[PDB]
Amino acid sequence: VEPVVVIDGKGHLVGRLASVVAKQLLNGQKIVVVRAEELNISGEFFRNKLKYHDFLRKATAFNKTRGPFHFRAPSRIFYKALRGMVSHKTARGKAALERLKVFEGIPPPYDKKKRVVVPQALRVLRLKPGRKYTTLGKLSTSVGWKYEDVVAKLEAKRKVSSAEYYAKKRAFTKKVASANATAAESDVAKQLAALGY
Amino acid sequence: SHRKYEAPRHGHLGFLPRKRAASIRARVKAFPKDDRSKPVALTSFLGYK
Amino acid sequence: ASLPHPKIVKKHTKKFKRHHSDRYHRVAENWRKQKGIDSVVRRRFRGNISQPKIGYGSNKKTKFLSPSGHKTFLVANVKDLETLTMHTKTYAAEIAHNISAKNRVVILARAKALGIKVTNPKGRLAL
Amino acid sequence: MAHFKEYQVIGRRLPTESVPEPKLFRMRIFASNEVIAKSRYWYFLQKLHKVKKASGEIVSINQINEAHPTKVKNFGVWVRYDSRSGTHNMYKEIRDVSRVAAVETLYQDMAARHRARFRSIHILKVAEIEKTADVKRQYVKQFLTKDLKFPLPHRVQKSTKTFSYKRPSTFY
Amino acid sequence: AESHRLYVKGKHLSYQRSKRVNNPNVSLIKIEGVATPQDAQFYLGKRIAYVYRASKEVRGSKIRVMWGKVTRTHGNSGVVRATFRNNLPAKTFGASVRIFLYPSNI
RNA sequence: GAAAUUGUUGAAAGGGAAGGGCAUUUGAUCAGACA
RNA sequence: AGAACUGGCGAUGCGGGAUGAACCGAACGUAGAGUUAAGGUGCCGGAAUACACGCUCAUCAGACACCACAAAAGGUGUUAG
RNA sequence: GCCCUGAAAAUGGAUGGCGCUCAAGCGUGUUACCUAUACUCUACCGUCAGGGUUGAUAUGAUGCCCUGACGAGUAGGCAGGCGUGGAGGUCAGUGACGAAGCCUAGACCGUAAGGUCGGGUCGAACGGCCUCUAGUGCAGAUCUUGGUGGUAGUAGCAAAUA
RNA sequence: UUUGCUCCACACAAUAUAGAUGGAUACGAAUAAGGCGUCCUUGUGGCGUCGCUGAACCAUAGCAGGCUAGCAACGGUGCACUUGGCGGAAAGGCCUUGGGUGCUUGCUGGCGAAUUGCAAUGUCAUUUUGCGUGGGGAUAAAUCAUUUGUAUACGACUUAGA
Ligand SMILES: [Mg+2]
Ligand SMILES: [Mg+2]
Ligand SMILES: [Mg+2]
Ligand SMILES: [Mg+2]
Ligand SMILES: [Mg+2]
Ligand SMILES: [Mg+2]
Ligand SMILES: [Mg+2]
Ligand SMILES: [Mg+2]
Ligand SMILES: [Mg+2]
Ligand SMILES: [Mg+2]
Ligand SMILES: [Mg+2]
Ligand SMILES: [Mg+2]
Ligand SMILES: [Mg+2]
Ligand SMILES: [Mg+2]
Ligand SMILES: [Mg+2]
Ligand SMILES: [Mg+2]
Ligand SMILES: [Mg+2]
Ligand SMILES: [Mg+2]
Ligand SMILES: [Mg+2]
Ligand SMILES: [Mg+2]
Ligand SMILES: [Mg+2]
Ligand SMILES: [Mg+2]
Ligand SMILES: [Mg+2]
Ligand SMILES: [Mg+2]
Ligand SMILES: [Mg+2]
Ligand SMILES: [Mg+2]
Ligand SMILES: [Mg+2]
Ligand SMILES: [Mg+2]
Ligand SMILES: [Mg+2]
Ligand SMILES: [Mg+2]
Ligand SMILES: [Mg+2]
Ligand SMILES: [Mg+2]
Ligand SMILES: [Mg+2]
Ligand SMILES: [Mg+2]
Ligand SMILES: [Mg+2]
Ligand SMILES: [Mg+2]
Ligand SMILES: [Mg+2]
Ligand SMILES: [Mg+2]
Ligand SMILES: [Mg+2]
Ligand SMILES: [Mg+2]
Ligand SMILES: [Mg+2]
Ligand SMILES: [Mg+2]
Ligand SMILES: [Mg+2]
Ligand SMILES: [Mg+2]
Ligand SMILES: [Mg+2]
Ligand SMILES: [Mg+2]
Ligand SMILES: [Mg+2]
Ligand SMILES: [Mg+2]
Ligand SMILES: [Mg+2]
Ligand SMILES: [Mg+2]
Ligand SMILES: [Mg+2]
Ligand SMILES: [Mg+2]
Ligand SMILES: [Mg+2]
Ligand SMILES: [Mg+2]
Ligand SMILES: [Mg+2]
């Protein structure tokens, strides 16, 4: 559809967001994902916290370096969910993964670009209302992630500036609609209506 | 089988690897928590033993 | 110039090399059939080399034809060459490898006059 | 077992010299096709009389159609079933628009609640509960209260493309 | 104009395959904007170009093209099967491709 | 004056072996047939 | 460990059961087009993040025959009787 | 019924992995869809079988032509063939104007054993066909004899005063 | 060591390419609730309206887009300049001023297009590098050997030397 698709992680379910991100790559679609700290997992926080420590104990006995690596960051928790859905040990697999970028927050370029969403992984459309679920950022911070507060600080800063942008814009688009209206009832305008516009 | 007799291990795994350091000048891996009320000054100093 | 014929269909151009002929020098590529008891090849496990078998045999109609349509025929002298006088559209003369240089030009020359195709004119050609 | 039709089946003990014109028994049978229906018939019949298909004859098979297929109706349903550890009679109530719909969801319910597959179930009786207040199960009664209305809160529209440019909304 | 495009964009997905065995003689193609087998019936028979580049000029160009045709639809979500004159290289899994509008039937 | 095995030159490839099968890209290389 | 009848493996690849002598499907000349089996169709991975009614929330949930285990006994968790 | 307790083992780890909770879970139903060396249709190969055809004046009667069905395979049987050394016949065969041999990700024929050619190297002999003959075909035998590697510029070359 | 380096400009030459072919089109937050307009007492406020998909919005006509004329507008837009300002999460981009300049399909005109032969991607992207030309700019170091012992099996480390 588009050269790059930026996805607001926020309010999406890891393995569903993953499952679509994976396919998208394999089919040639570059993707970036943002706000992975605001990503969701079904199951109450404790369940996934316990789950994560399961992951923690696995390590190469003779040398904990050769062994499974545990990344604590929300983007990186995501990427794990994703990499596992990609034949990442093949050229074609290494290729697809490189069309992928994951990020906590929304760092430059991507904050002036538009982000989309993936309804078939949106939590609010998928989870039965009532079921307990989990936020990546809180999960990660529990297993070592060092940077929740900083991301939050920078985001609130970012969210302010973007509120200016919008306001500024909603102003301009009000004028536009006004103009667009004093041209209504004209011939050109009625003709277009006829043709569905 | 099982040790036979128990004894603590030999030495501390918190100091691995036990390799030569990357420099003669050990690094300050942390500084004192900042209290911005006090006047300005350093928080360390160089010297020779 | 050859008799017309149906499209020549080769069925399996790839040479059938011996198993492990690529693995140890002492094993020539010349086909040789595995007889051993456990062998993957002889048991035709998905993944290994195929073996020659009668399915691959070429169309009775185009067999022995070589690209140009002519069956080749080894030729040592003129007399030999001349056996293809009433068969120019069907056989091609190939000059034997031990024919001398000066004999090759006598053969080539006659072949021309008879309109007989030669498959290796250029052999020993004092160019 | 699928999507049922209801059949009247009629059979009767192959005639004999000393008993020409034996007696004729009918069963209503919910099955998905007439072949299964004739099987079921013989199944219960050898459970009641001394016959089996070998020595008997199906006389007539006819699909019965719902009398008022767009009339909402309160069905009282009676069932015999086998569990893992014993066998059990049971009464359920189903509200729908035809005996054929009703038996579809009973088999659904029996399977979903008691893990009863089709083989292990016996319809005793399906009949239209005429006067309300001889309706007994609440989960039905609930739908008879006057001027009933309810919202359908938290609306989930199915997305047709993978990406969306909005953030949805479940207003409804 | 800014647009000149007379084809429809498309993607080389996989070969035809089992779980563990693929068949290079059939490629599977995702056609932009086609979602159903019915939808994809329109494109059956349309011809398909995979267009690539190279270092050696040849018949005076540095652009070569593999040609093929859509042959049948594939599964439930608008994917389509295709054959090509020579099977496509498999590095192309995930590369673009053009489906033309000819042979026309409108 | 073969082979194992070696030096040089030229070309290629190489993220914990290598070699193989079906298929095609790319490079190199080549037969035939046109009239 | 030892018999009975058949079907197999041994002597046999192919598809499925991740894996595997014996299970399931199906037995093999070289190939094109079609259709299927058993088994599958979120992604790995070809194939509906299909439809439909229930049930289930596990601070060690569960997830498909052979098969890679669990029992007596209990629960005022919840479901239907 | 599902769930919970009852439920303890040794390297870190397995519903196949990711991950999934109005499921991507459990019970059940309805469609569609994917894909085996299997099924249907078609070409080609081979095997077996049934026909047809001695009529000259041209080329295979073990032939030529039509038709149908079939094709797994250890041990094992049989068959039709490939290749070597020597022997009878023959082609008045090849050859110092270069035999044989050897080399060659060059060509061509055969399903295959193998066969043919080109180029290079070489230097005295050699082959096709019908027969005859056997000291006749190698990857193995802790096979025989010879030759050669990795190991490796490695172990080491340090007793007896200098 | 034979005039080398760098930044801008063009030029030739190579080499590539995980895959341009109108546009990645920017609040936040909630989902048992929101967006937008409007009013007012500025609030968890009144009133109005929208959703039910981006099937949208924007752009889009001209030799892949030629050469030309005019009118109505004073708008749009490309480009190099200049004014003020904002952006450090990876800012390396955004906004604003002012003249200049090209285009305008807002409307109306003159000319052109064939023979690429009934299709053949019919070649319009961007990667990295190499070689000369001349427009700005800049004129080091590391290593060996020597040496110290805060170091050391050898390398390595740490000093020192116009
Ligand atoms: Mg102990
Ligand atoms: Mg170091
Ligand atoms: Mg052998
Ligand atoms: Mg063995
Ligand atoms: Mg065996
Ligand atoms: Mg009735
Ligand atoms: Mg010599
Ligand atoms: Mg090479
Ligand atoms: Mg190949
Ligand atoms: Mg059996
Ligand atoms: Mg045995
Ligand atoms: Mg078998
Ligand atoms: Mg298999
Ligand atoms: Mg298993
Ligand atoms: Mg995987
Ligand atoms: Mg798929
Ligand atoms: Mg469907
Ligand atoms: Mg069982
Ligand atoms: Mg119990
Ligand atoms: Mg209970
Ligand atoms: Mg298991
Ligand atoms: Mg799975
Ligand atoms: Mg189910
Ligand atoms: Mg076949
Ligand atoms: Mg057949
Ligand atoms: Mg056989
Ligand atoms: Mg047999
Ligand atoms: Mg012989
Ligand atoms: Mg002999
Ligand atoms: Mg001898
Ligand atoms: Mg060689
Ligand atoms: Mg030749
Ligand atoms: Mg020569
Ligand atoms: Mg010679
Ligand atoms: Mg001599
Ligand atoms: Mg003989
Ligand atoms: Mg012998
Ligand atoms: Mg052997
Ligand atoms: Mg040997
Ligand atoms: Mg042997
Ligand atoms: Mg030996
Ligand atoms: Mg030796
Ligand atoms: Mg030495
Ligand atoms: Mg030494
Ligand atoms: Mg010693
Ligand atoms: Mg001494
Ligand atoms: Mg590439
Ligand atoms: Mg409102
Ligand atoms: Mg407002
Ligand atoms: Mg209000
Ligand atoms: Mg819009
Ligand atoms: Mg113009
Ligand atoms: Mg970035
Ligand atoms: Mg004009
Ligand atoms: Mg210069």
From Swiss-Prot, chain A:
UniProt key word Cytoplasm: yes
Alphabetically ordered keywords of this record: Acetylation, Cytoplasm, Isopeptide bond, Ribonucleoprotein, Ribosomal protein, Ubl conjugation
Glycyl lysine isopeptide (Lys-Gly) (interchain with G-Cter in ubiquitin) cross-link, chain position(s): K175
GO cellular component, one term: cytosolic large ribosomal subunit
GO molecular function: mRNA binding; RNA binding; structural constituent of ribosome
Mod. after translation: N-terminally acetylated by acetyltransferase NatA.
UniProt subcellular location: Cytoplasm
Entry's family note: Belongs to the universal ribosomal protein uL13 family.
Record function comment: Component of the ribosome, a large ribonucleoprotein complex responsible for the synthesis of proteins in the cell. The small ribosomal subunit (SSU) binds messenger RNAs (mRNAs) and translates the encoded message by selecting cognate aminoacyl-transfer RNA (tRNA) molecules. The large subunit (LSU) contains the ribosomal catalytic site termed the peptidyl transferase center (PTC), which catalyzes the formation of peptide bonds, thereby polymerizing the amino acids delivered by tRNAs into a polypeptide chain.
Misc note: Present with 43300 molecules/cell in log phase SD medium.
UniProt-recorded name of the protein: Large ribosomal subunit protein uL13A
Top-level taxonomy: Eukaryota, Fungi, Dikarya, Ascomycota, Saccharomycotina
UniProt gene name: RPL16A
Curated annotation (Swiss-Prot), chain B:
Highest taxon listed in the record's lineage: Eukaryota
Phosphoserine PTM positions: S23
Gene deletion effect: A mutant confers resistance to trichodermin, a trichotecene toxin produced by plant-pathogenic fungi.
Cross-link (Glycyl lysine isopeptide (Lys-Gly) (interchain with G-Cter in ubiquitin)): K38
Description of how the protein assembles with itself and partners: Component of the large ribosomal subunit (LSU). Mature yeast ribosomes consist of a small (40S) and a large (60S) subunit. The 40S small subunit contains 1 molecule of ribosomal RNA (18S rRNA) and 33 different proteins (encoded by 57 genes). The large 60S subunit contains 3 rRNA molecules (25S, 5.8S and 5S rRNA) and 46 different proteins (encoded by 81 genes). uL3 forms together with ES39L one of the contact sites for the signal recognition particle that targets ribosomes to the endoplasmic reticulum membrane.
Similarity annotation: Belongs to the universal ribosomal protein uL3 family.
Known role: Component of the ribosome, a large ribonucleoprotein complex responsible for the synthesis of proteins in the cell. The small ribosomal subunit (SSU) binds messenger RNAs (mRNAs) and translates the encoded message by selecting cognate aminoacyl-transfer RNA (tRNA) molecules. The large subunit (LSU) contains the ribosomal catalytic site termed the peptidyl transferase center (PTC), which catalyzes the formation of peptide bonds, thereby polymerizing the amino acids delivered by tRNAs into a polypeptide chain.
Record protein name field: Large ribosomal subunit protein uL3
Gene behind this protein: RPL3
From Swiss-Prot, chain C:
Function: Component of the ribosome, a large ribonucleoprotein complex responsible for the synthesis of proteins in the cell. The small ribosomal subunit (SSU) binds messenger RNAs (mRNAs) and translates the encoded message by selecting cognate aminoacyl-transfer RNA (tRNA) molecules. The large subunit (LSU) contains the ribosomal catalytic site termed the peptidyl transferase center (PTC), which catalyzes the formation of peptide bonds, thereby polymerizing the amino acids delivered by tRNAs into a polypeptide chain.
Subunit description: Component of the large ribosomal subunit (LSU). Mature yeast ribosomes consist of a small (40S) and a large (60S) subunit. The 40S small subunit contains 1 molecule of ribosomal RNA (18S rRNA) and 33 different proteins (encoded by 57 genes). The large 60S subunit contains 3 rRNA molecules (25S, 5.8S and 5S rRNA) and 46 different proteins (encoded by 81 genes).
Ribonucleoprotein recorded as keyword: yes
Name of the molecule in the record: Large ribosomal subunit protein eL32
Annotated gene: RPL32
Pfam families the UniProt entry points to: Ribosomal_L32e (PF01655)
Family classification: Belongs to the eukaryotic ribosomal protein eL32 family.
Organism: Saccharomyces cerevisiae (strain ATCC 204508 / S288c)
PANTHER family: 60S RIBOSOMAL PROTEIN L32 AND DNA-DIRECTED RNA POLYMERASE II, SUBUNIT N, RIBOSOMAL PROTEIN L32
SMART domains (UniProt xref): Ribosomal_L32e
Subcellular location: Cytoplasm
Chain positions with Phosphoserine modification: S39
Entry's Gene Ontology cellular component terms: cytoplasm; cytosol; cytosolic large ribosomal subunit
Any one biological process term the GO annotation gives: cytoplasmic translation
UniProtKB/Swiss-Prot annotation, chain E:
Residues the record lists as N-acetylalanine modifications: A1
GO MF: structural constituent of ribosome
Biological-process GO terms, alphabetical: cytoplasmic translation; ribosomal large subunit assembly; ribosomal large subunit biogenesis; rRNA processing
Location of the protein in the cell: Cytoplasm
InterPro entries from the UniProt entry: Ribosomal_eL33, Ribosomal_eL33_CS, Ribosomal_eL33_sf, Transl_B-barrel_sf
Post-translational modification: N-terminally acetylated by acetyltransferase NatA.
Cross-link Glycyl lysine isopeptide (Lys-Gly) (interchain with G-Cter in ubiquitin), sequence positions: K46
Record's function text: Component of the ribosome, a large ribonucleoprotein complex responsible for the synthesis of proteins in the cell. The small ribosomal subunit (SSU) binds messenger RNAs (mRNAs) and translates the encoded message by selecting cognate aminoacyl-transfer RNA (tRNA) molecules. The large subunit (LSU) contains the ribosomal catalytic site termed the peptidyl transferase center (PTC), which catalyzes the formation of peptide bonds, thereby polymerizing the amino acids delivered by tRNAs into a polypeptide chain.
Record-stated family: Belongs to the eukaryotic ribosomal protein eL33 family.
Note: There are 2 genes for eL33 in yeast.
PANTHER family assigned to the protein according to its UniProt record, in alphabetical order: 60S RIBOSOMAL PROTEIN L35A (PTHR10902)
This protein's name: Large ribosomal subunit protein eL33A
Organism: Saccharomyces cerevisiae (strain ATCC 204508 / S288c) (Baker's yeast)
Gene name linked to the record: RPL33A
